[PDB]
């Protein structure tokens, strides 16, 4: 089935022959993500026929098949603008059950969410119309159903994925989920239920949890102010406890590193005072965080986003908790015997962290030097002894500690 032929059936075709035409096109292209530029206008003609019936309203008989054709065509940049209109996005939202304006077919809901994810991911116009339509309201509510919902894993995952796409790409939707919709409390609950204290997280629960973490990162990375109230502090502390469980948890399918990374990144957004839960001697979490960072020091092109969050978290734990500061000091900066080998030479942890003090990125320099500085209890000669003056000079200068 070619695009021109399928488009011909939709125009001049009986009900049973237009469904087979789409049925065959969906079979041949269920995994089509590259498209031939020759039949480009054929696909755009077919896409405009699919949108006309979608905007009019599909009968329940031909709904899963019609949306699958739209989902396939939405993978093409050329057919994209045909699907990104208000009526079209309103029809997909209504079929997904997330429209603000009939029972739901779970296969229709699944296909509508996938269609919406593709258009929102690919089209700023679609992102703008999705913000205007307020899809985030019903999305967060259904996500907030929690144990009260028999919705399948697929529907729950694509709600979160659509929640991630809207909050990552649209700052107005991002702030709406944070402020008006109280998304932090909503997604902390959804995280708590996705986790259950199993020693292994199943593959399905691993996917939804990490989406929840990435949505939580979008709404917390630049919206939480320095001074919070006790409701927010208790909310963030509770959320931090779930992140402590993720750090200590293993994930099926060799995804334990991927889950830990998102948990650490979200930790880096919480108010610093709320990191005390990582300690409630008992350094199991810090030990895991320390080796998490130690394994990330091999990243070169993506070093910044790999080590800065965990170093910032370790630095704050050491700064506010004396047993953590001393434990990390014993692990990172063990007492020197021979003081001849330069600090910036070697493969030990202290050597890797000193070399970052003269990194090219100013964020890496400050974050690495601040870490070793607080492990030295902010003592200038102790800081110089362990890191060497030339490496220490950057921090000491920035803090006005030369005089």
């Amino acid at each position: 089935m070619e695009p021109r032929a399928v488009a011909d059936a939709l125009e001049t075709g009986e009900e049973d022959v237009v469904m087979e035409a789409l049925r065959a096109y969906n079979r041949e292209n269920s995994q089509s993500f590259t498209f031939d530029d020759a039949q480009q206008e054929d696909r755009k003609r077919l896409a405009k026929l699919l949108v006309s019936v979608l905007e009019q309203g599909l009968p329940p008989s031909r709904r899963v098949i019609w949306l699958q054709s739209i989902r396939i065509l939405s993978r093409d940049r050329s057919c994209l603008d045909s699907f990104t209109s208000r009526r079209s996005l309103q029809a997909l939202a209504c079929y997904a059950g997330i429209s603000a304006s009939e029972p739901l077919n779970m296969d229709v809901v699944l296909e509508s969410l996938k269609c919406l994810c593709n258009l929102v991911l690919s089209s700023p116009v679609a992102q703008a119309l999705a913000a205007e339509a307020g899809l985030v309201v019903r999305l967060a509510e259904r996500v907030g159903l929690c144990r009260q919902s028999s919705f399948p894993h697929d529907v729950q995952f694509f709600d979160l994925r659509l929640l991630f796409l809207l909050t990552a790409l649209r700052t107005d939707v991002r702030q709406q989920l944070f402020q008006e919709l109280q998304g932090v409390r909503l997604l902390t609950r959804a995280l708590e239920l996705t986790l259950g204290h199993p020693e292994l997280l199943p593959p399905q629960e691993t996917e939804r949890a990490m989406e929840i973490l990435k949505v939580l990162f979008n709404i917390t990375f630049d919206s939480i102010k320095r001074e919070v109230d006790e409701e927010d502090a208790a909310l963030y502390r509770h959320l931090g406890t779930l992140l402590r469980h993720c750090v200590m948890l293993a994930a099926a399918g060799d995804r334990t590193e991927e889950l830990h990374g998102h948990a650490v990144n979200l930790l880096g957004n919480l108010p610093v005072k709320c990191l005390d839960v990582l300690l409630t001697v008992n350094m199991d979490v810090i030990r895991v965080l320390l080796s998490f960072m130690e394994k990330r020091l091999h990243q070169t092109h993506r070093l910044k986003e790999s080590v800065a969050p965990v170093l910032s978290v370790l630095t704050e734990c050491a700064r506010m908790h004396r047993p953590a500061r001393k434990f990390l000091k014993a692990q990172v900066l063990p007492p020197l015997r021979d003081v001849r080998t330069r600090p910036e030479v070697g493969e030990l942890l202290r050597n890797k962290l000193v070399r970052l003090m003269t990194h090219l990125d100013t964020d890496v320099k400050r974050v690495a030097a601040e870490f070793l500085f607080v492990l030295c209890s902010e003592s200038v000669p102790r800081f110089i002894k362990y890191t060497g003056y030339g490496n220490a000079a950057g921090l000491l200068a920035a803090r006005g500690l030369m005089a």
Partner: protein, 393 residues
Amino acid sequence: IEEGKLVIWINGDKGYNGLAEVGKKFEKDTGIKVTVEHPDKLEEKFPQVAATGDGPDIIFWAHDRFGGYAQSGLLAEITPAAAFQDKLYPFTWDAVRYNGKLIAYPIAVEALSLIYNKDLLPNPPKTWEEIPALDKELKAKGKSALMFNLQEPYFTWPLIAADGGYAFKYAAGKYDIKDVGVDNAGAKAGLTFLVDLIKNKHMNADTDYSIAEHAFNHGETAMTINGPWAWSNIDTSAVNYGVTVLPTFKGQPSKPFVGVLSAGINAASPNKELAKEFLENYLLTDEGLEAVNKDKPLGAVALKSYEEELAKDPRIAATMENAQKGEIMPNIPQMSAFWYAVRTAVINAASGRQTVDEALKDAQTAAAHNVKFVFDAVTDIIIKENLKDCGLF
């Protein structure tokens, strides 16, 4: 890079289909195939692929980028006979003059204008300050007053430069690298009014080119700021529109940056003579320019003979009135670093990441030193990486 062919790169918002018609006529007479392409990030893609010896035979862009291209040895010297140079306006020949040498053929003068919906807004406003009141009145019918691209500093710059902001000061018959007017009182006042429109919810910080165009062309917003290339899509739509002078900020005219669309010849091209015959004897004629202008309007074309056929167009008259009240863009190699800094400053000020004074202060330092603060904070990298991990289903 193939010989016997002509590969042409032009931006995606221009009449690339119209330019393909001129290539068809070129193949009809000479038998030489012409391929027109509109790659994304065209102004960045060309330096990276031409410096290695690839890229198109002919490169189309506004004149401001051609100095940096010529400074890097990427452009070949053009040799138009004095008989050909007289068919085009001298002021457009000035825009492609780098170190007293002609590096590109000028095509058409561009400038932003205020496009408005005659049905929603029969009397367009003359000042920026009345737009908040106008958007209030228009929100009562489910509409808004103004939407335009807030992701490119080119569209914000008219409001920025109105009260005194500028790029590089022109003095002693030359642009000096170190005199930059990005963080003066005027540029701070213009960018602040822009940011205040967004805080008061008359404009959205996430609005790009396609979002603004979609809203105006579907009758949702009463006004948009765009150039001559955008008139065709508004013609095709159901919108009855007019093109008028930009509003006045603080009683002073908005000063858009005037660009001259230009066609440069690649230094690595083995078809530098076919490129000359295509641009002189086919494109820069009445037939060649009409074919492109019919697709997407060019503005005021550099060719005298065809600009006469278009001058009475009230949209061209409004384009020139805005062009007269603006500034011809510099083409110095520092322009590339200038736009990079102001793009970051507009986005950061609009999104509320920095204040007006912070964003413009950092942009001044980077633009004064021809440097690029390729920073990106950690939280921004994580979001962009989580987004990049998302594929299609």
